[PDB]
Scaffold this active site. Structure first.
Site, PDB file in Angstrom:
ATOM      1  CE  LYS A 285      -7.915 102.345   3.360  1.00 12.25           C
ATOM      2  NZ  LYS A 285      -7.032 101.417   2.637  1.00 12.25           N
TER       3      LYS A 285
ATOM      4  CD1 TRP B  81      -6.870  95.725   6.653  1.00  9.32           C
ATOM      5  CD2 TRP B  81      -5.691  96.822   8.205  1.00  9.32           C
ATOM      6  NE1 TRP B  81      -5.765  96.267   6.032  1.00  9.32           N
ATOM      7  CE2 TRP B  81      -5.030  96.951   6.972  1.00  9.32           C
ATOM      8  CE3 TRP B  81      -5.127  97.394   9.341  1.00  9.32           C
ATOM      9  CZ2 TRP B  81      -3.822  97.653   6.847  1.00  9.32           C
ATOM     10  CZ3 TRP B  81      -3.944  98.111   9.212  1.00  9.32           C
ATOM     11  CH2 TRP B  81      -3.303  98.209   8.000  1.00  9.32           C
TER      12      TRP B  81
ATOM     13  CG  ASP C 213     -11.604  99.669   9.876  1.00  2.46           C
ATOM     14  OD1 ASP C 213     -11.773 100.574   9.023  1.00  2.46           O
ATOM     15  OD2 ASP C 213     -10.511  99.029  10.057  1.00  2.46           O
TER      16      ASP C 213
HETATM   17  C1  LIG Z   1      -9.711  98.267   6.592  1.00  2.00           C
HETATM   18  C2  LIG Z   1      -8.504  99.077   7.108  1.00  2.00           C
HETATM   19  N1  LIG Z   1      -8.456  99.425   8.407  1.00  2.00           N
HETATM   20  C3  LIG Z   1      -7.439 100.142   8.919  1.00  2.00           C
HETATM   21  C4  LIG Z   1      -6.385 100.553   8.099  1.00  2.00           C
HETATM   22  C5  LIG Z   1      -5.271 101.387   8.719  1.00  2.00           C
HETATM   23  O1  LIG Z   1      -5.506 102.734   8.317  1.00  2.00           O
HETATM   24  P1  LIG Z   1      -4.384 103.906   8.430  1.00  2.00           P
HETATM   25  O2  LIG Z   1      -3.179 103.522   7.615  1.00  2.00           O
HETATM   26  O3  LIG Z   1      -5.056 105.193   8.041  1.00  2.00           O
HETATM   27  O4  LIG Z   1      -4.023 103.968   9.924  1.00  2.00           O
HETATM   28  C6  LIG Z   1      -6.401 100.218   6.770  1.00  2.00           C
HETATM   29  C7  LIG Z   1      -5.267 100.708   5.858  1.00  2.00           C
HETATM   30  N2  LIG Z   1      -5.150  99.915   4.652  1.00  2.00           N
HETATM   31  C8  LIG Z   1      -7.466  99.498   6.272  1.00  2.00           C
HETATM   32  O5  LIG Z   1      -7.519  99.139   4.932  1.00  2.00           O
END
Ligand SMILES: Cc1ncc(COP(=O)(O)O)c(CN)c1O
Ligand SMILES: Cc1ncc(COP(=O)(O)O)c(CN)c1O
Ligand code: NA
Lengths: 361, 362
Positions: free
Chosen positions: B197, B103, B173
């Site tokens: 989540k 991520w 994040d």
């Molecule tokens: C830690 C983390 N950051 C970013 C994201 C991306 O988020 P989104 O699908 O809402 O764009 C995720 C999605 N699993 C995530 O777990």
């Protein structure tokens, strides 16, 4: 107390049988053991839902396979940026026909990303007309021509569509989406937020001809890039799953109603009741929009006795007809009468207008 | 299954039953307003009460100081990967990253469109199993900010303490550990995360941002990515994700009823310990690759020594109503996501299942 007649312009009233279906499925969707709100977007249940939503929408609007259907977040306002970011180079030119303030918002955002030519604006007559298409002077190398098909604040709706001299047609159909048949093949892109006719806020639909996808500007965010969304079938990131599910329920129900030819007939019928009441009022109520382009979805009107407008709105609400207040700049009223507004709500409003007029004669 | 299952999905995720049942009860007509939350004007008094209470409840839960804004946006965390450098940097500024999973790596790639990036440290060489010692991190002397992913959802690496940015501020994040525990918000310039989540359904992204960092976005920033526009319009510049915001509001209100984030953390630690202890006590039958001190309370990746049995483990667990346990394609195995709303009894059932499985296949 009971459900009201809800004239809100977006988000908006939704079919009661759809709402009750969502209620019944909410805790545990079809024995899957979880809510739609808890499903993995890469799981088989959600995949079935988004696939059925796409197939149902394709059937409803008659969207052929030469077009992609994208279920996105960010509202129509995010598309105001995405369109020129994907479809133009920084020194390309887009033509706009501006028939109300939503088109004007689209022009201002596009100026960040390319050149804009407003080839016609309705502003000088308070956004009450659509131009004669033959007299438009279109830019000879324009990449596309942008219209707002139904100007939600101003009540101006295209019934026929212009033919771009070069390039393709892009329409914001937010506030009349799935209200009537549309020959998709006339367009390069049709887009709209779900939250007037097809679902709750949080989902935006983009219908884009496949040969126009790709080659976005380098500064395009990944989340605004049509090729990314298309190649991942709207599952590049986490989609608005519950919203897409709700759209799917609405699309299914519009097919059950007999499809968009039938939906159009009902929309024309109920809008005629209100416009006829206005025109028969001997000026007591007034609609500024030119007759041939009066929206079936958004009906703006004023009172000759402007000082009565607050009383009209307040008493209508006491009679369970809410969100009839009109825009700051003309005042008055706006009756939004989207697909799911019951015929009885329009009839109640027309009766209330008749009674109000007789009382303030 | 007409009983609810134990849902180990990594996002969207399991939600509290009392929240779902409240939403069911009120879906047709919210509090005699005469309409659903899904039909409300975002400029009307009912929805204003909902979004304002959601913000108020979140400020209490996290102890957010007054000098921070709270924005409820669409687009997911991925849209913030672009919005962050667009708002906070000029095109020739540098952002420092600590990359502890994929991520963070995605955040780096997107930021490069908008400014310069510098990965000070990557965990990739040891398959993303550690967090670096902070003092030895060589930060860029004029970096605008330092970016971390506080909980790397695929890799199971979680920050317990946080690095101190040298020149700028800290951005995290927290998508997959958001409201799992207390956070000293004043240590950050920005915290952001998707709701899907811990705090709601997909479709809503929360951004907590220090007010003195708002304004001055790059000229090319879309209006929908501009923090100043969202802040001065209180997240109602355009039509917000009303129903998602409502749902997040319900979750926040329930987390306060549970006793707040100190209590939520205790429960999270307790159920995570059950699963990690089962793995460690298995004499190598199950394995977790993550270094002990940074093991996530939210996402638990694990593999079998007999990897040929992983598919059967997952299929058999699903028959026993423990679903979505499959791990990521690069390591195989399993990933048990055990967010706030995952009942203790689901973790207990998985641990019992693991015991039986090992006894059977030893
Ligand atoms: C830690 C983390 N950051 C970013 C994201 C991306 O988020 P989104 O699908 O809402 O764009 C995720 C999605 N699993 C995530 O777990
Ligand atoms: C015709 C039209 N275009 C664009 C918009 C903007 O949509 P959103 O709020 O989803 O960004 C609206 C919202 N009322 C609209 O009616
Ligand atoms: Na030229």
């Amino acid at each position: 107390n009971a459900r009201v007649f809800n004239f809100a312009a977006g988000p908006a009233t939704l079919p009661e049988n759809v709402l009750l279906k969502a209620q019944a499925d909410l805790y545990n969707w079809r024995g899957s053991g979880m809510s739609v709100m808890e499903m993995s977007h890469r799981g088989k249940e959600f995949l079935s839902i988004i696939q059925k939503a796409e197939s149902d929408l394709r059937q409803l609007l008659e969207i052929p396979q030469e077009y992609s259907v994208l279920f996105l977040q960010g509202g129509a306002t995010t598309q105001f940026a995405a369109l020129p970011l994907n479809l133009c180079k920084s020194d390309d030119t887009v033509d706009f026909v501006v028939t109300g303030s939503w088109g004007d918002k689209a022009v201002k955002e596009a100026k960040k990303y390319c050149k804009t030519n407003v080839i016609w604006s309705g502003k000088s007559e308070k956004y009450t007309k659509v131009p004669s298409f033959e007299e438009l002077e279109q830019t000879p190398d324009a990449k596309y021509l942008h219209i707002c098909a139904n100007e939600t604040i101003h009540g101006v709706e295209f019934k026929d569509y212009p033919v771009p001299k070069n390039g393709f047609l892009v329409a914001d159909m937010s506030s009349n989406f799935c209200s009537k048949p549309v020959d998709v093949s006339k367009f390069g892109v049709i887009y709209g937020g779900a939250q007037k006719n097809v679902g709750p806020s949080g989902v935006t639909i983009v219908i884009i001809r496949k040969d126009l996808i790709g080659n976005a500007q380098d500064i395009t965010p990944v989340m605004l890039d049509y090729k990314i969304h298309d190649e991942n079938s709207s599952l590049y990131n986490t989609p608005p799953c519950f919203g897409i599910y709700m759209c799917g329920l609405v699309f299914e129900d519009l097919l059950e109603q007999g499809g968009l030819k039938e939906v159009e007939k009902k929309n024309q019928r109920k809008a005629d009741l209100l416009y006829n009441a206005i025109e028969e009022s001997n000026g007591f109520f007034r609609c500024p929009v030119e007759k041939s382009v009066r929206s079936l979805m958004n009906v703006p009107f004023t009172l000759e006795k402007s000082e009565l407008e607050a009383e009209f709105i307040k008493e209508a609400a006491k009679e369970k007809m809410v969100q009839l207040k009109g825009h700051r700049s003309v005042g008055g009223m706006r009756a939004s009468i989207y697909n799911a507004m019951p015929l009885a709500g329009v009839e109640k409003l027309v009766a209330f207008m008749k009674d109000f007029q007789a009382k303030h004669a």
